[PDB]
Amino acid sequence: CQGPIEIKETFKYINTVVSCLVFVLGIIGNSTLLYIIYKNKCMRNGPNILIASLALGDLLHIVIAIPINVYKLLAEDWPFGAEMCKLVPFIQKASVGITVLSLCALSIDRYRAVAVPKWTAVEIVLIWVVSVVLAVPEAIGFDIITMDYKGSYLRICLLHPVQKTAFMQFYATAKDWWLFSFYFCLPLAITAFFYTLMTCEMLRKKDADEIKRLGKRFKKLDLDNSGSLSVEEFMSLPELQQNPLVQRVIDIFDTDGNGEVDFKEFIEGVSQFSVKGDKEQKLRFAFRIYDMDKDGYISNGELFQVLKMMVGNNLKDTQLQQIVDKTIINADKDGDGRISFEEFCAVVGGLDIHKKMVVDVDHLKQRREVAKTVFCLVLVFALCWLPLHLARILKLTLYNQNDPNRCELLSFLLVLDYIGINMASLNSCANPIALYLVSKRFKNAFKSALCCWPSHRLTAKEVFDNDGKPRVDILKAHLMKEGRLEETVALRIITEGASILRQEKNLLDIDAPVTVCGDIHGQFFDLMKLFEVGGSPANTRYLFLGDYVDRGYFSIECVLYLWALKILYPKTLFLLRGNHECRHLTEYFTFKQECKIKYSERVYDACMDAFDCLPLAALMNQQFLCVHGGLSPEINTLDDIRKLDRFKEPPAYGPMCDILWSDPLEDFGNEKTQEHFTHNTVRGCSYFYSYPAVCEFLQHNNLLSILRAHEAQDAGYRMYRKSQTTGFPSLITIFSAPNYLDVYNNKAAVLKYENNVMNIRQFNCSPHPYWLPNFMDVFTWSLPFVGEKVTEMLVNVLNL
Amino acid sequence: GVEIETISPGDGRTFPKKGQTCVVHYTGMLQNGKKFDSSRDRNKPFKFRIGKQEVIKGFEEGAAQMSLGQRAKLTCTPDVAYGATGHPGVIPPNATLIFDVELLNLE
Ligand SMILES: C=CC[C@@H]1/C=C(\C)C[C@H](C)C[C@H](OC)[C@H]2O[C@@](O)(C(=O)C(=O)N3CCCC[C@H]3C(=O)O[C@H](/C(C)=C/[C@@H]3CC[C@@H](O)[C@H](OC)C3)[C@H](C)[C@@H](O)CC1=O)[C@H](C)C[C@@H]2OC
Ligand SMILES: [Ca+2]
Numbered sequence: 025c026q027g028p029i030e031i032k033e034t035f036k037y038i039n040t041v042v043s044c045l046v047f048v049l050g051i052i053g054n055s056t057l058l059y060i061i062y063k064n065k066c067m068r069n070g071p072n073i074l075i076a077s078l079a080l081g082d083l084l085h086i087v088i089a090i091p092i093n094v095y096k097l098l099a100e101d102w103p104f105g106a107e108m109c110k111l112v113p114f115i116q117k118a119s120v121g122i123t124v125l126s127l128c129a130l131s132i133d134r135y136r137a138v139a140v141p142k143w144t145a146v147e148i149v150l151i152w153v154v155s156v157v158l159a160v161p162e163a164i165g166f167d168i169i170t171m172d173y174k175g176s177y178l179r180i181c182l183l184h185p186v187q188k189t190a191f192m193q194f195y196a197t198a199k200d201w202w203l204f205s206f207y208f209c210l211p212l213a214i215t216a217f218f219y220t221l222m223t224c225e226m227l228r229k230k231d232a233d234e235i236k237r238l239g240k241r242f243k244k245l246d247l248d249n250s251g252s253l254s255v256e257e258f259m260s261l262p263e264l265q266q267n268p269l270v271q272r273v274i275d276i277f278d279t280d281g282n283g284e285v286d287f288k289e290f291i292e293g294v295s296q297f298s299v300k301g302d303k304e305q306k307l308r309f310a311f312r313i314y315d316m317d318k319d320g321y322i323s324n325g326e327l328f329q330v331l332k333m334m335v336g337n338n339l340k341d342t343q344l345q346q347i348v349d350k351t352i353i354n355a356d357k358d359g360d361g362r363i364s365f366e367e368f369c370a371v372v373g374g375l376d377i378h379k380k381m382v383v384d385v386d387h388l389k390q391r392r393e394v395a396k397t398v399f400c401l402v403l404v405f406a407l408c409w410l411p412l413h414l415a416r417i418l419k420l421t422l423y424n425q426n427d428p429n430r431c432e433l434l435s436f437l438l439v440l441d442y443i444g445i446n447m448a449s450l451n452s453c454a455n456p457i458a459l460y461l462v463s464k465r466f467k468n469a470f471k472s473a474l475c476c477w478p479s480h481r482l483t484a485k486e487v488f489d490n491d492g493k494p495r496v497d498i499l500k501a502h503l504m505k506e507g508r509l510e511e512t513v514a515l516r517i518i519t520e521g522a523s524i525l526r527q528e529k530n531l532l533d534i535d536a537p538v539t540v541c542g543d544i545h546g547q548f549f550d551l552m553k554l555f556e557v558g559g560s561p562a563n564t565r566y567l568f569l570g571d572y573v574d575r576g577y578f579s580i581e582c583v584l585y586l587w588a589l590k591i592l593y594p595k596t597l598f599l600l601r602g603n604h605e606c607r608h609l610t611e612y613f614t615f616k617q618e619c620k621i622k623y624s625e626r627v628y629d630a631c632m633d634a635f636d637c638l639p640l641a642a643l644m645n646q647q648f649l650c651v652h653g654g655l656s657p658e659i660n661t662l663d664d665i666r667k668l669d670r671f672k673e674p675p676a677y678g679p680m681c682d683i684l685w686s687d688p689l690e691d692f693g694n695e696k697t698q699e700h701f702t703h704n705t706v707r708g709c710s711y712f713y714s715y716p717a718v719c720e721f722l723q724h725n726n727l728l729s730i731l732r733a734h735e736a737q738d739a740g741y742r743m744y745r746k747s748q749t750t751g752f753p754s755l756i757t758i759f760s761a762p763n764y765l766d767v768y769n770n771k772a773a774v775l776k777y778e779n780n781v782m783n784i785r786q787f788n789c790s791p792h793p794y795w796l797p798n799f800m801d802v803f804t805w806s807l808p809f810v811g812e813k814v815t816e817m818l819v820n821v822l823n824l
Numbered sequence: 825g826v827e828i829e830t831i832s833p834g835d836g837r838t839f840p841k842k843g844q845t846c847v848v849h850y851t852g853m854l855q856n857g858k859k860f861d862s863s864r865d866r867n868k869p870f871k872f873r874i875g876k877q878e879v880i881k882g883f884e885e886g887a888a889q890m891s892l893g894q895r896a897k898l899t900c901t902p903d904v905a906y907g908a909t910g911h912p913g914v915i916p917p918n919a920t921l922i923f924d925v926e927l928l929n930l931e
């Protein structure tokens with residue numbers, strides 16, 4: 025005829041432009057949808073993972089079918105091989121297989137609740153495999169046969185007019201009937217049949233007797249019978265006058281902010297605490313406790329004021345503030361200085377607090393928002409694939425070429441057929457669009473992900489200068505203000521410093537003058553207090569006798585600063601190994617828990633590689649032997665330590681453990697027996713070494729005295745009995761941790777040696793910021809108390 | 825399951841009573857000797873009231889058996905502690921706790 029010529033040319037540019045709009049919107053809309061699901065841990069869900077399956081299934085169709093489908097239109101030829109031709113319809117008819125079946129699974133899933141989990145994984149795989157099996161017929165029949173237009177040999181993909189088997193012949197004749205049946209009749213029947221049944225089930229026994237039950241109490245609590253509950257009337261229960269969170273919970277109940285709660289507001293709040301309540305909404309009530317102004321975001325000052333109520337006078341105004349900044353900084357994944365509900369999930373997702381917010385009620389009536397998307401996604405699919413199937417049916421029933429005015433009827437059909445194809449492609453780029461416009465939960469996540477795309481971690485360019493030498497002033501000031509470093513730079517300091525330790529001998533040669541320092545145990549703010557007492561590390565030699573970690577809350581700052589100081593001054597700062605630098609103790613104590621919270625698990629592994637390279641002992645000016653612990657039964661001469669293999673985790677027995685764990689006797693210098701070594705009951709391993717053991721060892725190696733650590737001293741030092749041979753104190757213990765464990769209230773000391781003069785310089789504790797037990801934040805700290813208090817109120821309000 | 829061991833004696837005449845507030849310093853450590861919390865770290869005491877279940881039943885029973893100024897070591901078995909649930913982030917499940925508590929004042 026004459027109709028199709030102009031229609032085909034008219035839609036040649038219309039079809040390609042629409043496919044471009046689908047491509048641009050589809051590639052960014054569907055990809056962002058996947059990026060939302062895995063980043064946000066509350067968005068995982070079970071109905072929200074099938075939606076991600078829709079986007080992944082449609083993305084594959086967009087990146088493969090649409091581009092080459094465009095090149096069919098513009099070129100009117102197939103420049104590709106036969107293998108590509110069987111790939112075009114196979115995937116296009118497979119993607120609608122996932123789209124159709126997922127909408128069926130989503131419908132069944134929602135009726136399941138009304139009537140990634142383990143049973144979810146089978147649904148995703150079963151949907152995908154079943155869809156692909158039914159897309160095989162397209163892949164079988166497509167090939168390049170039977171066209172020759174005016175002597176021009178052109179390659180065009182089409183269904184084979186003659187099939188290898190009669191089964192495919194049946195498929196070829198009734199291809200539209202099979203497309204209309206399994207892909208249109210099957211989903212729309214299943215999705216609607218379960219939704220029709222869902223509406224009937226929800227309608228019946230919705231109000232039930234429960235709303236009648238709560239109505240009995242609501243009038244009773246309303247003393248003035250004003251139809252609404254005031255704050256004063258909530259104070260009328262003796263059991264609530266001592267609950268600190270009643271004023272907060274009333275704010276959630278009072279939705280309109282008029283200061284008083286009516287019956288409809290009362291019923292809504294109780295529904296949130298039902299036994300059938302879902303995880304995501306109970307976490308929202310806990311979120312609304314802190315969010316005072318109902319702006320959806322927890323701010324620094326609002327988190328403090330809420331906590332000040334529950335904490336009471338158990339903490340200072342400064343201490344409660346200090347953990348609030350740290351909680352905000354660590355939980356703020358956006359850097360906006362405030363916490364949203366998505367960030368609130370990442371903190372308390374695995375705390376299982378929602379299992380405590382339980383009362384004895386039902387009828388959550390929350391199935392409105394979640395099921396709107398499922399019925400809207402089916403709504404979008406129905407209104408996009410409806411025109412295409414309607415064109416084919418029009419051909420089957422009403423079209424007859426025997427009619428005189430046949431051309432006019434085909435004119436309307438071919439215009440609609442091209443439109444039906446264009447709308448059918450639109451469904452591949454429409455599902456993210458509908459979600460962003462329908463659901464609040466997806467809307468907020470989309471705003472943050474796309475439109476929105478001290479807490480500052482120091483960067484490698486700032487800590488290191490152009491020569492690779494770390495700058496101590498910058499690193500000290502930032503660390504002292506609770507600052508942290510980049511994950512890579514933290515590794516760089518530990519690894520670069522550990523190499524310097526690797527080259528240095530087991531037995532150090534240290535010349536006077538030098539400062540000897542004892543245990544630090546993570547007391548970073550006490551560590552800087554040490555440095556002014558002994559002098560600047562640049563021009564004063566320091567010897568640390570071990571114990572850099574554990575028992576404190578700033579262990580990583582002590583490690584980073586000392587290892588950073590090791591790099592800048594390899595020849596004037598000397599580090600020795602203590603019993604806490606091993607995997608055995610840090611698992612037991614808090615160093616590992618610190619590394620997980622503060623930097624990562626990978627930084628912790630790097631520390632143990634460096635902790636293995638730590639020297640065991642040092643020889644001080646050829647008269648003093650410096651060691652963390654004491655002597656060993658298996659070591660009689662200094663060269664014995666030189667032969668040891670230090671690049672390993674210390675064994676539970678042997679010379680190395682005896683070096684790092686041995687203690688002097690309680691009656692040292694006045695022992696009742698002459699036994700040199702006895703089992704150490706206090707430590708549980710290594711040995712006690714007595715006064716005869718020390719003097720023999722000093723004389724045999726021509727040594728004057730021994731400097732050690734590893735024992736707490738009230739004055740920071742302890743001068744033991746003087747050796748008979750030299751008249752000098754045989755053993756000296758240096759403990760440089762002031763107010764050790766913040767319970768001992770002791771003093772710390774550093775030993776200054778110069779001009780053969782023995783000097784002891786003491787210093788006291790310094791103020792340090794406050795960390796909660798196990799480095800936790802205030803949300804983990806308080807939610808067990810929030811969940812208990814709100815449950816105590818709700819049960820007292822309702823059950824009476 | 826509450827065990828009380830005396831560390832330093834008090835006056836032996838004054839005891840906490842129902843309805844009034846106890847002011848104590850406490851040091852909470854696990855059965856293995858690992859410390860997790862203590863009020864002396866904060867340099868302020870801990871205030872709680874007898875009979876309103878502000879603390880776990882194990883801690884409350886021991887504090888009522890202490891005299892004014894007395895300091896004693898308390899044992900908290902899981903039945904009179906956080907039990908099988910524990911406390912998220914501090915206490916491993918089914919852990920026995922040891923508390924070193926000093927009674928300063930009563931109101
Ligand atoms: C900011 C709001 C929270 C609010 C926090 C404070 C006022 C600061 C206060 C110094 C608590 C400490 O915070 C640094 C910290 O003290 C511990 O370290 C601790 O040594 C401990 O065991 N103590 C403290 C001393 C009294 C005994 C016991 C306790 O009775 O603690 C109580 C406790 C945990 C009750 C649980 C609550 C959960 C229920 O499921 C469970 O029901 C069985 C009972 C505490 C005092 C609550 O009444 C009050 C709070 O929680 C806990 C290991 C965890 C606790 O932080 C939570
Ligand atoms: Ca009223």
Ligand SMILES: [Ca+2]
Binds near residue numbers: 279
């Ligand atoms: Ca109201």
Ligand SMILES: [Ca+2]
Binds near residue numbers: 315
């Ligand atoms: Ca706010």
Ligand SMILES: [Ca+2]
Binds near residue numbers: 360
């Ligand atoms: Ca934020």
Ligand SMILES: [Fe+3]
Binds near residue numbers: 543735
């Ligand atoms: Fe130590």
Ligand SMILES: [Zn+2]
Binds near residue numbers: 543602603604734
């Ligand atoms: Zn030590």
